[PDB]
Ligand binder design. Structure first.
Ligand SMILES: CC(=O)N[C@@H]1[C@@H](O)[C@H](O[C@@H]2O[C@H](CO)[C@H](O)[C@H](O[C@]3(C(=O)O)C[C@H](O)[C@@H](NC(C)=O)[C@H]([C@H](O)[C@H](O)CO)O3)[C@H]2O)[C@@H](CO)O[C@H]1O
Ligand SMILES: *[C@@H]1O[C@H](CO[C@@H]2O[C@@H](C)[C@@H](O)[C@@H](O)[C@@H]2O)[C@@H](O[C@@H]2O[C@H](CO)[C@@H](O)[C@H](O)[C@H]2NC(C)=O)[C@H](O)[C@H]1NC(C)=O
Ligand SMILES: *[C@@H]1O[C@H](CO[C@@H]2O[C@@H](C)[C@@H](O)[C@@H](O)[C@@H]2O)[C@@H](O[C@@H]2O[C@H](CO)[C@@H](O)[C@H](O)[C@H]2NC(C)=O)[C@H](O)[C@H]1NC(C)=O
Ligand SMILES: *[C@@H]1O[C@H](CO)[C@@H](O[C@@H]2O[C@H](CO)[C@@H](O)[C@H](O)[C@H]2NC(C)=O)[C@H](O)[C@H]1NC(C)=O
Ligand SMILES: C[N+](C)(C)CC(=O)N/N=C/c1ccccn1
Ligand SMILES: C[N+](C)(C)CC(=O)N/N=C/c1ccccn1
Ligand SMILES: [Cl-]
Ligand SMILES: [Cl-]
Ligand SMILES: [Cl-]
Ligand SMILES: [Cl-]
Ligand SMILES: [Cl-]
Ligand SMILES: [Cl-]
Ligand SMILES: [Cl-]
Ligand SMILES: [Cl-]
Ligand SMILES: [Cl-]
Ligand SMILES: [Cl-]
Ligand SMILES: [Cl-]
Ligand SMILES: [Cl-]
Ligand SMILES: [Cl-]
Ligand SMILES: [Cl-]
Ligand SMILES: [Cl-]
Ligand SMILES: [Cl-]
Ligand SMILES: [Cl-]
Ligand SMILES: [Cl-]
Ligand SMILES: [Cl-]
Ligand SMILES: [Cl-]
Ligand SMILES: [Cl-]
Ligand SMILES: [Cl-]
Ligand SMILES: [Cl-]
Ligand SMILES: [Cl-]
Ligand SMILES: [Cl-]
Ligand SMILES: [Cl-]
Ligand SMILES: [Cl-]
Ligand SMILES: [Cl-]
Ligand SMILES: [Cl-]
Ligand SMILES: [Cl-]
Ligand SMILES: [Cl-]
Ligand SMILES: [Cl-]
Ligand SMILES: [Cl-]
Ligand SMILES: [Cl-]
Ligand SMILES: [Cl-]
Ligand SMILES: [Cl-]
Ligand SMILES: [Mg+2]
Ligand SMILES: [Mg+2]
Ligand SMILES: [Mg+2]
Ligand SMILES: [Mg+2]
Ligand SMILES: [Mg+2]
Ligand SMILES: [Mg+2]
Ligand SMILES: [Mg+2]
Ligand SMILES: [Mg+2]
Ligand SMILES: [Mg+2]
Ligand SMILES: [Mg+2]
Ligand SMILES: [Mg+2]
Ligand SMILES: [Mg+2]
Ligand SMILES: [Zn+2]
Ligand SMILES: [Zn+2]
Ligand SMILES: [Zn+2]
Ligand SMILES: [Zn+2]
Lengths: 533, 535
């Protein structure tokens, strides 16, 4: 019917009606937003999609951008839920729109979701990103886009116009430009556009906040388990060159314009098969192709722009999960497995510190180890495992997020912080991993409401609470209800009081400090030490 | 009384009967154990006392070695109890013996006490060091001696033969030699001598373990709130020369150069040297007094930390401990914003400054490590927290962690080690409540001072003091502070490098706990060295 037929600036779309226990939602899946970045357009900033004849079929998710498909635990849902669920294609720059079925006659606010995956993986078609429940429950419009990952999104020869860098970020910015122009055709309000994302998606949200050409395309920002100032999310120019020139040597590619032309002649699968082999430490925490500090998108290091920005007028929702680090340990760290209790040894632990804190001196590593050993039980394997889980989690997610949250708060922003502390009753990982990196998203998106998944009565209620908080924030920059007794339940995060809430089944609880003591080491002392040595 | 006339290798002594509530003790006070270190003998090692004719009057304490007198809180009980209580004289090398009234029939173990005072102060004649109550209640023999402090005991021009250094420690060794030769006259057993000391006396006891010629003179060791590997307890030969010649400059002594310089210092009156001792290294408090034991390669063949890691320690029984609030007393002596008369609610600015006072001579980066370690990053402005924090910084750095280091290294090489944390604040205690259990305030209880009728301690406190006297007396008799065949009480398990068990001493029964600030002392004993040498 005419509810599923929409015309945007480029032409006609035909969407699909999706069902929700609450009721139906109108969905437009796989709307092209850039000309396919293929052949000579590989590694280049995206070009806007030109108008098309006829009716585009937006009834299903388009393709996934090329990436390594994880095969650590084959057939295991804990890993499979995150793997690509469409064909891989360099023809992948498509976005998706969910909107209420009585299409809003008034302009409703817009959530835009940027998926994470450490800049080396990810897809908007993953099942845990289904916008239908968030839309049907809170009557906002939800948009999500694909953006190039891996070398396709982030190979850079700083200097050249052929491989400029950060084109995966520009993919996102283009889709936000698209939202500006077309969201109103679906009921959306271009003037209330809230960015949210997790992991590299959250780091992405962070860079749009620091990149002036993007700061005009959205108004509020949610960062979940990621920060642009994290040790894994940017790379220098001179290093970006070495990594590009190395991938080229690996793929058999004999100046800069000549380098890119050879890479462009290689099947996309050949680049994916070598991009992990670029760095000797084949680590998840220093993946080869991430955003570059070139002076373009980022006029300075993310740290530099944070410490110097006026963030008056910005509201920000920010948080981590309880155990950020445990998911990364099974992907590398020596002694670990989803299939036993991963009872690490001291030397396995000393070794793991180097894998999760890569590229720090020897003195810095000893500092980490002395800082995180329990000197009354120096060789307890369980305690050691938890310690290492904290070392990588604190260093890569928590202390970066914290450092950003306080700086934003201190320099004019209005911040609300959380820690996600619910372990799903469906969670297929082992119990020692706890609440792992990535496992709040199911709840933000209202997945427990899907009748076919097997979540708890109490868990559906929790997901609705969370959706309420997020939509509240989208609407007003304030997750609290505009009208309620005992009204300031969720207080703002400030550099002093450092209040956050804990999100779980029990009613909101305020706590002080996001690993305040731990993050003093990472944000304040460790740099001084890397310096004077 | 036949018990008060006693004869010693040097000659005859007349002693005095002292009263305890529980009964008499006979005491010999101010026995000359060395020829007086005067004029030409100033700064030299001690010569043994030439023997005398007649009866030495050993019925009253002799003089106190020259030293700074504390003018900080005039009249105040808390400071005055430590101040010299006899005339200051360079003629001060005498020792004291308390022995049970009916002199013991069989050879009883001997406790030798070495007083503290950070090597710039102290005297065996102070009231809290009265042996009578311990000797009456446990029937051991007790000895204490005076040793030279300040520049008179520790000024060194390494290589001089004029000022060889460590003569204050030689003073103590001379008295231990005297005990070996003479305590038999008082019913004491020279084959069962236990040293015990506090503060710089505990550091002294430690250096005696590390100096072979002293190991023949005792068999067990108790170290209370002090250790020879503390940052304040020793000095290099090169630093020792700077400080010696800087003092010579402050007194007007043109600097053979070593022999002129010392002969000049000898002419200056003793009080003039005391006056400038602290101005050799001006500082705000009490850490790093400038005339301490020197690592000369004679008395201390190597640094204490070297001597500890490879030493002859198997079979040694050691008793070792700290007070609950080791830091707070030092802060009162010059940490910015500290007095005994207000709550010492310091600002962050004074906290940062106080870190450099209590942890002197460390790099700017090292000091930042300290701050970032002891700050409470949830309440970094809270003045009360900052106050306790800085107390722990200086308490950990100067006392607790050096003692924890010594304990585990002894235990590792096969010493039998027993560790305590004294955590009872005397109901009499005159210092303010926020200093808690300050440095030096277990001594009163070890010595049974609560038994003294004039001082009104509690009954709970008297039975406690008797409990402590028994622990220490048990230890002196048998190298084990536990009630021999009595496991009706909780056992005091020995300290090992793995489990790290110690007992809390207070008015409640023995409580066994693990780890002497294990987390804190990793920083001080392991990381901070690496940091300081790698940068
Ligand atoms: C008691 C008795 O029967 N005879 C003693 C006699 O043994 C003693 O001589 C001293 O014995 C001690 C034993 O512990 C040392 O071995 C002395 O050698 C040293 C020392 O190591 O202490 C050598 C040291 O280099 C000297 N230091 C200097 C010169 O700076 C000291 C110094 O003489 C001190 O006076 C000792 O405390 O001695 C050994 O000489 C003598 C006193 O020395 O007394 C007898 O009665
Ligand atoms: C716990 O498991 C890890 C991972 O090994 C996997 O899971 C086990 C249950 C077992 O079935 C293995 O075959 C699996 O591959 C163990 O770490 C591995 O140990 C082997 C020893 O032969 C070694 O070759 C591997 O490299 C190790 N893997 C890593 C990542 O280091 C570990 O030994 C198991 N046991 C304990 C006590 O942790
Ligand atoms: C708590 O007391 C200290 C003690 O210092 C003072 O000592 C005397 C010289 C006299 O000024 C008394 O009133 C005090 O007891 C205070 O620290 C001093 O503060 C004054 C000025 O306020 C300053 O001139 C001194 O240098 C300070 N001493 C230092 C830095 O060591 C402290 O301010 C008191 N706190 C209060 C009153 O809240
Ligand atoms: C790298 O070398 C290539 C050669 O493959 C250079 O390409 C030139 O491009 C211009 C375009 O106007 C041609 O007219 C030339 O004939 C090409 N070949 C040359 C100059 O040898 C390219 O300019 C070089 N890249 C640089 C200098 O950045
Ligand atoms: C967890 N999820 C399955 C949603 C994908 C993801 O987030 N993978 N994480 C990569 C990474 C690596 C280093 C630092 C941060 N993120
Ligand atoms: C008088 N009292 C019992 C407190 C003796 C004492 O302990 N005086 N202080 C010594 C000191 C100084 C610096 C470092 C270590 N100890
Ligand atoms: Cl368009
Ligand atoms: Cl469906
Ligand atoms: Cl048409
Ligand atoms: Cl606007
Ligand atoms: Cl642009
Ligand atoms: Cl950065
Ligand atoms: Cl870099
Ligand atoms: Cl570089
Ligand atoms: Cl290949
Ligand atoms: Cl491969
Ligand atoms: Cl791989
Ligand atoms: Cl937690
Ligand atoms: Cl290095
Ligand atoms: Cl345990
Ligand atoms: Cl505001
Ligand atoms: Cl149910
Ligand atoms: Cl904290
Ligand atoms: Cl005499
Ligand atoms: Cl002379
Ligand atoms: Cl006389
Ligand atoms: Cl005199
Ligand atoms: Cl021995
Ligand atoms: Cl030297
Ligand atoms: Cl030197
Ligand atoms: Cl000379
Ligand atoms: Cl040392
Ligand atoms: Cl303690
Ligand atoms: Cl410096
Ligand atoms: Cl730290
Ligand atoms: Cl505060
Ligand atoms: Cl607290
Ligand atoms: Cl043994
Ligand atoms: Cl008081
Ligand atoms: Cl024996
Ligand atoms: Cl305990
Ligand atoms: Cl501890
Ligand atoms: Mg992977
Ligand atoms: Mg190959
Ligand atoms: Mg090769
Ligand atoms: Mg254990
Ligand atoms: Mg006289
Ligand atoms: Mg005289
Ligand atoms: Mg010399
Ligand atoms: Mg030196
Ligand atoms: Mg001058
Ligand atoms: Mg003067
Ligand atoms: Mg335990
Ligand atoms: Mg501790
Ligand atoms: Zn991630
Ligand atoms: Zn591979
Ligand atoms: Zn540390
Ligand atoms: Zn002392």
């Amino acid at each position: 019917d005419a509810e599923l037929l929409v015309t945007v600036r480029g032409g006609r779309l035909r969407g699909i009606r999706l069902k929700t226990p609450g009721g139906p939602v109108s969905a437009f899946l796989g709307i092209p937003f850039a000309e396919p970045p293929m052949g000579p357009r590989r590694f280049l900033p995206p070009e806007p999609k030109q108008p098309w004849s006829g009716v585009v079929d937006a009834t299903t998710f388009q393709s996934v951008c090329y990436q390594y498909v994880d095969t650590l635990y084959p057939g295991f849902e804990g890993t499979e839920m995150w793997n690509p669920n469409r064909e891989l294609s360099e023809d992948c720059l498509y976005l998706n729109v969910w909107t209420p079925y009585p299409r809003p006659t008034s302009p409703t606010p817009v959530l835009v979701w940027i998926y994470g995956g450490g800049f080396y993986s990810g897809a908007s078609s993953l099942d845990v990103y289904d916008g239908r429940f968030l839309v049907q429950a809170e009557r906002t419009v939800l948009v999500s886009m694909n953006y190039r990952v891996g070398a396709f999104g982030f190979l850079a020869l700083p200097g050249s116009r052929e491989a400029p860098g950060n084109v995966g970020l520009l993919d996102q910015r283009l889709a936000l430009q698209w939202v500006q122009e077309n969201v109103a055709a679906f009921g959306g309000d271009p003037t209330s556009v809230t960015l949210f994302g997790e992991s590299a998606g959250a780091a992405s949200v962070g860079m749009h906040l620091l990149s002036p050409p993007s700061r005009g395309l959205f108004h509020r920002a949610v960062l979940q388990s990621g920060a642009p100032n994290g040790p894994w999310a940017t790379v220098g120019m001179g290093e970006a060159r070495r990594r590009a020139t190395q991938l080229a040597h690996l793929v058999g590619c004999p100046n800069d314009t000549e380098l890119v032309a050879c890479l462009r002649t290689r099947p996309a699968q050949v680049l994916v098969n070598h991009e992990w082999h670029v760095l000797p430490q084949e680590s998840v925490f220093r993946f080869s192709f991430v955003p570059v500090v070139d002076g373009d998108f980022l006029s300075d290091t993310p740290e530099a722009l944070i410490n110097a920005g006026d963030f008056h007028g910005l509201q920000v929702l920010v948080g981590v999960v309880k155990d950020e680090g445990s998911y990364f340990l099974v992907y590398g760290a020596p002694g670990f497995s989803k299939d036993n209790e991963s009872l690490i040894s001291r030397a396995e632990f000393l070794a793991g510190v180097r894998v999760g804190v890569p590229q720090v001196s020897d003195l810095a590593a000893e500092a980490v180890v002395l800082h995180y050993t329990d000197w009354l039980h120096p060789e307890d394997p369980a305690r050691l495992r938890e310690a290492l889980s904290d070392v990588v989690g604190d260093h890569n997610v928590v202390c970066p997020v914290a450092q950003l949250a306080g700086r934003l708060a201190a320099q004019g922003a209005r911040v609300y912080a959380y820690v996600f502390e619910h372990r799903a009753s469906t969670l297929s990982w082992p119990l020692w991993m706890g609440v792992p990196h990535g496992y709040e998203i199911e709840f933000i998106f209202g997945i427990p409401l899907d009748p076919s998944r097997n979540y708890t009565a109490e868990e559906k209620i929790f997901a609705q609470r969370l959706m309420r908080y997020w939509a509240n924030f989208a609407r007003t920059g304030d997750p609290n209800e505009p009208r309620d007794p005992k009204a300031p339940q969720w207080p703002p995060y400030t550099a002093g009081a450092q209040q956050y809430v804990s999100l779980d089944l029990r009613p909101l609880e305020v706590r002080r400090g996001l690993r305040a003591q731990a993050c003093a080491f990472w944000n304040r002392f460790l740099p001084k030490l890397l310096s004077a040595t």
